[PDB]
Design a protein around this ligand. Structure first.
Ligand code: HEM
Ligand code: HEM
Ligand code: HEM
Ligand code: HEM
Lengths: 145, 141, 141, 145
């Protein structure tokens, strides 16, 4: 899983993340970098250009909820499957999201942390965050059937 | 092939990358080899531990090749011809590994040039490196 | 594109597939949906339980399109341009899914035509289905 | 993991597998279908043609060993990682094999079982074997570092 060094490093940096903005920044970048993902959020309104997405209030609000789920995962690294079961069933049964897409949001989240933390987001810190996002992705794909 | 506005972003950021090419290449490879250790399998005789002078040297060559693609951004496959033959015919690198390197370069750029790494530039770079990755991979593999 | 020995195994195996096209299609999809259930996310309103009429009908169309590729094997991208728009722009099917389907069709062919399914035939079909998949997939994704 | 139905099914069919042949058939196909994998077995001699490969005595003897490793995993489904630890270090440290290749061998083995069992290798039986071959690939990539 995560070593004492890795788990303390992701926990420590996460305590410095602006929870009202990082999730919205990651969801926005997903929608801009991987445009097909917009199909899932039609009710969010105007996602027609990069500026429209990054200034969209519904993108920022849903991103805060996504960030909240990652924080939960970070607080339960030893039981991600149980933690994400309900969300997993939601993404499968009601949302119909190909789980291959979860990896893309994880990667965009990692880019956002790098973007915010700059030099502090060292290669070992990233490697630790990659284990987390791969873990969250796997847990969120676990109840598909 | 990229949009005109996209190519503009790639060209402009490359100017900033060029003066820090060496540390960008090195950081990109340290992120890759530490985050995705399995990629080290393709470099059996390299010392790929962080700080290795061999890792630093390979990174400069990677960033230089990215540079060539930027110079011939309108004819990427043409410019990378020999490199394509090398990674396909000779090295036979699985396609997934290019996505891993591309992600690590993006992470590197996001942390080094935060003001220029907008969602729009992120998308331009993700697309440019996907074209580069496709040109470098064995077709259909 | 494929080579002579390859195009001829494709053409030759297709003759055998054509008389059992319906059940090869159905079996290919049942293997796919049961082995890789996440692929079902692309068919939200279909009944994809084994034996369903809807799954069977879809399997016939898939194998019939493979047939179109075999007929225009010298120019697959040309023959499948409408299906390509459908799978790339319209449905945006992730490339990984094509590999899952191709593997299931190979499994079906291996169980159906053991004598014709030599290592060489397996290689030409894996290669042919990779060409078909690239054609149908959003470029560079 | 594997259900009583899946576990019993894969175990029963495994009892009917020709252990001196299936492994070599799977390794042969890998070398023919994925030519690049030939680079790891240059001591094996002529692999220049499909017939060469399938007739190669070395392809067949090594194949028997790979088949044996799979039989071990089938006997240890609940502890594949412990079961494959050593082979994993071997494949990473000595052979330098990109673990993405393990998936290809698993797929090819699945095709060989289908080739031999025909109608008996039904879709639900395949789904069970897909979990086993993915589980073994995962375990074999586990000690990579
Ligand atoms: C892998 C990370 C992901 C996490 C941790 C995550 C988290 C969540 C959460 C917490 C909810 C919100 C439910 C609520 O407001 O109570 C949700 C809803 C949703 N998710 Fe995800 N999700 C993930 C990835 C994805 C992906 C990649 C897509 C689409 C490509 C997606 C599409 C949806 C949609 C469409 C909704 C419904 C939004 C609405 O209409 O309100 N999610 N997700
Ligand atoms: C944007 C993608 C990449 C670029 C631009 C790139 C570029 C280069 C360049 C310019 C060289 C040096 C060639 C020479 O010295 O003539 C090189 C060598 C090589 N590359 Fe890549 N590469 C990329 C991705 C990859 C990936 C994804 C892998 C595998 C993980 C990799 C494996 C190799 C290997 C093994 C060598 C030869 C190393 C040696 O023995 O000296 N490359 N690459
Ligand atoms: C060898 C590759 C495949 C072939 C030859 C193929 C062929 C077909 C054909 C013939 C159609 C019917 C189109 C029409 O009647 O207008 C179609 C539709 C469709 N295919 Fe594929 N397909 C392939 C791969 C995939 C994959 C890998 C997926 C996703 C798992 C997929 C998802 C779909 C969907 C969602 C539809 C539309 C169904 C509907 O709502 O009517 N296809 N495909
Ligand atoms: C995923 C299933 C795999 C299994 C279960 C497997 C199993 C084994 C075992 C048990 C050995 C022989 C150990 C001995 O002789 O005591 C071995 C060696 C070897 N394997 Fe794997 N292997 C797998 C995948 C691969 C792949 C895909 C490659 C390469 C593309 C590969 C390359 C090698 C090589 C080069 C050797 C040494 C062969 C020699 O020179 O004698 N293996 N493997």
């Amino acid at each position: 899983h995560l070593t004492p060094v890795e788990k303390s490093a992701v926990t420590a940096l996460w305590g410095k993340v602006n929870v009202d903005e990082v999730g919205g920044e990651a969801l926005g970048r997903l929608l801009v970098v991987y445009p097909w993902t917009q199909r899932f959020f039609e009710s969010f309104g105007d996602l027609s250009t990069p500026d429209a997405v990054m200034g969209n209030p519904k993108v920022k609000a849903h991103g805060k909820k996504v960030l909240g789920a990652f924080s939960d995962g970070l607080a339960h690294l030893d039981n991600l499957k149980g933690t994400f079961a309900t969300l997993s069933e939601l993404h499968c049964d009601k949302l119909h999201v190909d789980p291959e897409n979860f990896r893309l949001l994880g990667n965009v989240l990692v880019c956002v942390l790098a973007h915010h933390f700059g030099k502090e987001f060292t290669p070992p810190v990233q490697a630790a965050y990659q284990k987390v996002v791969a873990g969250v992705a796997n847990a969120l794909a676990h109840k598909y059937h | 092939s990229l949009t005109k506005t996209e190519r503009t972003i790639i060209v402009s950021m490359w100017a900033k990358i060029s003066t820090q090419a060496d540390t960008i290449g090195t950081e990109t490879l340290e992120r890759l080899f530490l985050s995705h250790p399995q990629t080290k399998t393709y470099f059996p005789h390299f010392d790929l531990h962080p700080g290795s002078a061999q890792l630093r040297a390979h990174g400069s060559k990677v960033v230089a090749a990215v540079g060539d693609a930027v110079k011939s951004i309108d004819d990427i496959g043409g410019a990378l011809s020999k490199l394509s033959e090398l990674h396909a015919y000779i090295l036979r690198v699985d396609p997934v590994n290019f996505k891993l390197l591309s992600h690590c370069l993006l992470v590197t750029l996001a942390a080094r040039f935060p003001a220029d790494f907008t969602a729009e530039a992120h998308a331009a770079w993700d697309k440019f490196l996907s074209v580069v990755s496709s040109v470098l991979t064995e077709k259909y593999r």
